Amino acid sequence: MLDKIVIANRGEIALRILRACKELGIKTVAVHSSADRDLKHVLLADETVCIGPAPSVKSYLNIPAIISAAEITGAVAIHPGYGFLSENANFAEQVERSGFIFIGPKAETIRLMGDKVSAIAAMKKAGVPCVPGSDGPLGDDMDKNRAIAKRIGYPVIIKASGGGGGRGMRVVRGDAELAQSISMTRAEAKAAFSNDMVYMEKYLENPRHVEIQVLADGQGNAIYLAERDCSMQRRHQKVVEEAPAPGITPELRRYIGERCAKACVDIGYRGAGTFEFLFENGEFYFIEMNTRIQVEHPVTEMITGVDLIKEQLRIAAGQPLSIKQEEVHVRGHAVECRINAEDPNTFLPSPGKITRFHAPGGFGVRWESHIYAGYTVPPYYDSMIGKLICYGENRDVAIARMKNALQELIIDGIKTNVDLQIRIMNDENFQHGGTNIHYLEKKLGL
Numbered sequence: 001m002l003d004k005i006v007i008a009n010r011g012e013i014a015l016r017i018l019r020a021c022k023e024l025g026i027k028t029v030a031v032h033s034s035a036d037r038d039l040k041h042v043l044l045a046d047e048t049v050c051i052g053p054a055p056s057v058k059s060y061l062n063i064p065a066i067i068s069a070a071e072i073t074g075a076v077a078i079h080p081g082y083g084f085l086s087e088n089a090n091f092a093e094q095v096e097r098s099g100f101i102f103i104g105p106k107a108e109t110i111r112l113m114g115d116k117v118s119a120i121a122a123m124k125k126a127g128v129p130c131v132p133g134s135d136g137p138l139g140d141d142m143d144k145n146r147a148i149a150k151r152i153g154y155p156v157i158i159k160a161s162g163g164g165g166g167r168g169m170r171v172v173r174g175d176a177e178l179a180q181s182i183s184m185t186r187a188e189a190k191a192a193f194s195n196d197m198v199y200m201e202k203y204l205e206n207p208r209h210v211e212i213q214v215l216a217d218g219q220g221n222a223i224y225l226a227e228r229d230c231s232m233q234r235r236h237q238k239v240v241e242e243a244p245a246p247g248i249t250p251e252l253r254r255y256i257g258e259r260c261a262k263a264c265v266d267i268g269y270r271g272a273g274t275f276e277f278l279f280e281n282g283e284f285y286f287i288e289m290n291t292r293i294q295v296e297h298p299v300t301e302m303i304t305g306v307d308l309i310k311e312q313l314r315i316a317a318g319q320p321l322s323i324k325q326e327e328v329h330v331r332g333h334a335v336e337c338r339i340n341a342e343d344p345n346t347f348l349p350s351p352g353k354i355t356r357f358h359a360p361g362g363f364g365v366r367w368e369s370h371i372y373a374g375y376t377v378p379p380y381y382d383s384m385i386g387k388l389i390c391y392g393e394n395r396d397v398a399i400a401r402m403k404n405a406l407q408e409l410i411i412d413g414i415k416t417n418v419d420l421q422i423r424i425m426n427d428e429n430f431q432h433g434g435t436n437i438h439y440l441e442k443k444l445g446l
Ligand SMILES: CC(C)=CCn1cnc(N)c2ncnc1-2
Pocket: 131, 157, 166, 169, 201, 202, 203, 204, 205, 278, 287
């Protein structure tokens, strides 16, 4: 087991990682900005290093500062959590070059799956179903681009290869908009990624977002841990997640899971990862792979019993997976509501000082948050301040427990989305299940 690690993150996920480390007897080094001295996990960590001022560019994105912290404390590995540098292949490469273990895949694998064109080609080769598309980048020949659009069939969508997560894409429903849509998508990618590569895919009108959790070790084992539905979104930001996904049969779960596990073997994947799909008319279509742990991992933990952070750490130390595929069973149902410090009318972040705080409790209730009474949510980072996860023997019990837990949650002094989450739990279409990626925005419009 790893002697000591740097937790290269903040907020709820840093706390999540710290607890896993403590369970395994791994010493913790909490690197933090000057604005984050009073983070719960920093206060609980074995050692702390202030790596820079509040702005992320000088702290949580500061590669030299993070590697220096690892060097100075005699740490042996770095866990990047999610966001920040977790999908930064150059960072992973520098970590391993500097002699530390990166808790994630090989840098080459991060790079492969961080290029959407190259990622799709690899998934297609491995036998994972993808969206019909250009299977290659678009050039400047509009005769050729119209022909690709014709072959796919309108509507199509133009997507940046260096993008992802709903960033940098345009829907095209006819030839008259194709040239300008390609040109604008290209320009925005060049400005944002210094990578002007774009591709074309079939546009799916009303899909659900369904993603598959995998784990792969250094001994050749690769397993899938069922799926999560993350269709409840606003501007491509997930708001509620659940596992398993309503209406997915054991046969479908098996079909898609095995293809994901096989893909991991083919690409030499290591650690935790997620295959994201659009699901429509009973069919899966790969869009992207997240080569890292995700925000919503706890719903999969609740339904499988597998501690995914502890698995990441075990894999990094050179231990095989603690469970075999035949030992992975979906039991019960879990729902996650993201708790955001945000204004209810503008949806902009709403930082400030929490004056009273009370967490819900009870059977099947899991609260993931660093916040406490008297804690100030700083303005420099993401609006998500906690995650409420509720488990039940079925989806209805999970939803009932969430309603009750949301009612016990007290966060005064700042504006939050608790009331909105209560509205969603009480929504008759959500209670039925299987709502698509457009539903929340449709509801919020009403
Ligand atoms: C609603 C929207 C802008 C996109 C939803 N959507 C539809 N079709 C595809 N092929 C996609 N790839 C990523 N997202 C996709």
